[PDB]
């Protein structure tokens, strides 16, 4: 980025892909729970 930045295990695209995958998993879990409810 700019000047000196702390070096992490994951780069920015990797960590943002992981965060987006976790968000998508949470959204899918919530939608599946909502689909399960209102039917039984």
């Amino acid at each position: 980025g700019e000047r000196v930045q702390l070096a992490h295990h994951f780069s920015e695209p990797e960590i943002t892909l992981i965060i987006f995958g976790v968000m998508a998993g949470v959204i899918g879990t919530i939608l599946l729970i909502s689909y399960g409810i209102r039917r039984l």
């Binding site: 980025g1 700019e2 930045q5 702390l6 994951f10 959204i27 909502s34």
Partner: protein, 517 residues
């Protein structure tokens, strides 16, 4: 548009099918000079608040986010919203409550030793989670309970705030250069004048008054009976650009006197290159970002979502009233999804999130409004105007020699014109005007001919109390609670108001389409 389908993403799909068939018309309907005049209007009307809020943000956040990031975010979000939105008449830009939240969050990060921009990244990440759940569960259907009461209260309050800030800027200009018997002729000018200068505040007042006078006179001249109708209407459409040009030339032909001008950054670079880059690591820039704040950012994300949701949805309700002759439809699910998602994405780049501002969108709708022989005829509903405004905002950095000759006082008069023209369609403003009129001069309208005079005056005065309460909240450090107090007016309409008024009175005074019950 506000009906509940019961299907996941049901509102999102219906909004797309409602507007996207008119996508071809959304380009062809813009082939008119009024669209170009609206572009020239809204370009300055969005650029000047953007510059001011960027400067304030840079001052209040140690230049972590400043003018350049705000301009880039405004341009990108405006372009993508005009290309993909369902109500393209909305203007996406920064607002005051967002600045207050940024102040509070920067103070919180400074107190707890947290990286402000990484916290913004995590909040924007939490913002995307909230909007997807709201859109999928048709959470935008709750806006149907916001009747004319809350909409008009919010619009009147926002217009009064805009006018108050416009006048306070001139008051601050007068305070910076007070009228004195003697002046120091040796005053440093760079970066800004460090001492009072003669003829500055008075010339600013003259420029603002002349700009407002010319704008109002050209607005009258549009509906006037002078000149051929085509030429007269063309001149009236370009009334605001003509007034801006006239006052800019007037100030330009006065070389000796100093007046504050527009200030854009030198280039497309971050405000502070020593703090952050264009892409901010979610794990931290200098210090390791703790895990607990990644979950604790949901509550500030909830507050941001509430603010943006209320602003954008109430603005969409105002601009899409049936009395405004909107015949192309609006989307409450698609627009909210686009705005909040783009804000969350731009948060990752260290750029401010935006919302559909009320005054700018209302002015954009009014600048495209075609008036018949008193009666609204049609509205130039198209995507080209907002797209061009966003493109010009993005290109504002490259055109500094043009913007550097435009004084702020001209923009102050333009903002005063916007504020006085944003009160046309509000029935609250009309009923406030009826407080100073004899009852026999009231117009033949449903809320007068079916309601007693003192009942209507009491109903208006109840809204005045709400306006005062909302104004007091803004003058407090807890001004981020303004959306909640604004929401509290909705129970007032549906719980406390029926306890004192009859059903016919509430139908006449609070009507969705101004009907006589």
């Amino acid at each position: 548009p506000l009906q509940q389908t019961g299907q996941l993403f049901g509102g999102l799909v219906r909004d797309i099918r409602r507007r996207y068939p008119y996508y071809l018309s959304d380009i062809t309907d813009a082939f008119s000079p009024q669209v170009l005049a609206a572009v020239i209007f809204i370009y300055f009307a969005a650029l000047s608040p953007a510059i001011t809020f960027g400067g304030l943000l840079g001052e209040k956040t140690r230049n972590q986010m400043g003018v350049s990031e705000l301009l880039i975010s405004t341009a990108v979000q405006g372009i993508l919203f005009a290309l993909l939105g369902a109500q393209p008449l909305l203007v996406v830009g920064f607002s005051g409550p967002l600045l207050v939240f940024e102040e509070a969050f920067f103070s919180f990060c400074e107190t707890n030793g947290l990286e402000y921009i990484v916290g913004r990244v995590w909040i924007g990440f939490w913002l995307i989670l909230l909007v997807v759940l709201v859109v999928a569960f048709e959470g935008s259907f709750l806006v149907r309970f916001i009747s004319r009461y809350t909409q008009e209260i919010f619009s009147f309050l926002i217009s009064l705030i805009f006018i108050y800030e416009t006048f306070s800027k001139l008051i601050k200009i007068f305070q910076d250069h007070p009228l004195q018997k003697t002046y120091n002729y040796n005053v440093l000018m760079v970066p800004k004048p460090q001492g009072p200068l003669p003829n500055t505040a008075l010339l600013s007042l003259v420029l603002m008054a002349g700009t407002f006078f010319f704008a109002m006179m050209l607005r009258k001249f549009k509906n006037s009976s002078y000149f051929p109708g085509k030429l007269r209407r063309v001149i009236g459409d370009f009334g605001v650009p003509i007034s801006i040009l006239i006052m800019v030339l007037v100030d330009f032909f006065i070389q000796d006197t100093y007046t504050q001008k527009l200030s854009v950054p030198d280039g497309f670079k971050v405000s502070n290159s020593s703090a952050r880059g264009w892409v901010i690591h979610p794990l931290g820039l200098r210090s390791e970002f703790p895990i607990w704040m990644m979950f604790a950012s949901a509550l500030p994300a909830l507050l941001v979502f509430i603010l943006i949701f209320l602003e954008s949805q109430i603005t969409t309700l105002i601009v899409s009233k049936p009395e405004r002759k909107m015949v192309k439809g609006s989307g409450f699910h698609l627009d909210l999804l686009l705005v909040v998602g783009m804000g969350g994405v731009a948060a990752l780049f260290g750029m401010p999130w935006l919302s559909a501002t009320t005054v700018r969108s209302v002015t954009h709708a009014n600048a495209l409004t075609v008036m018949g022989k008193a009666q609204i005829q049609e509205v130039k509903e198209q995507r080209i105007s907002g797209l061009l405004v966003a493109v010009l905002v993005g290109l504002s950095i490259l055109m500094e020699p043009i913007l550097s000759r435009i004084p702020l006082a001209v923009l102050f008069g333009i903002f005063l014109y916007m504020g006085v023209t944003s009160l046309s369609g509000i029935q609250l403003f009309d009923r406030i005007l009826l407080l100073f009129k004899p009852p026999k001069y009231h117009p033949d309208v449903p809320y007068v001919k079916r309601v007693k005079t003192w009942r209507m005056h009491l109903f208006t005065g109840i809204q005045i109390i709400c306006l005062a309460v909302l104004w007091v909240v803004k003058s407090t450090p807890a001004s981020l609670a303004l959306p909640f107090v604004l929401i509290l007016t909705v129970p007032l309409r549906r719980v406390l108001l029926p306890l004192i008024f009859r059903n016919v009175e509430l139908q006449c005074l609070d009507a969705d389409d101004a009907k006589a019950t």
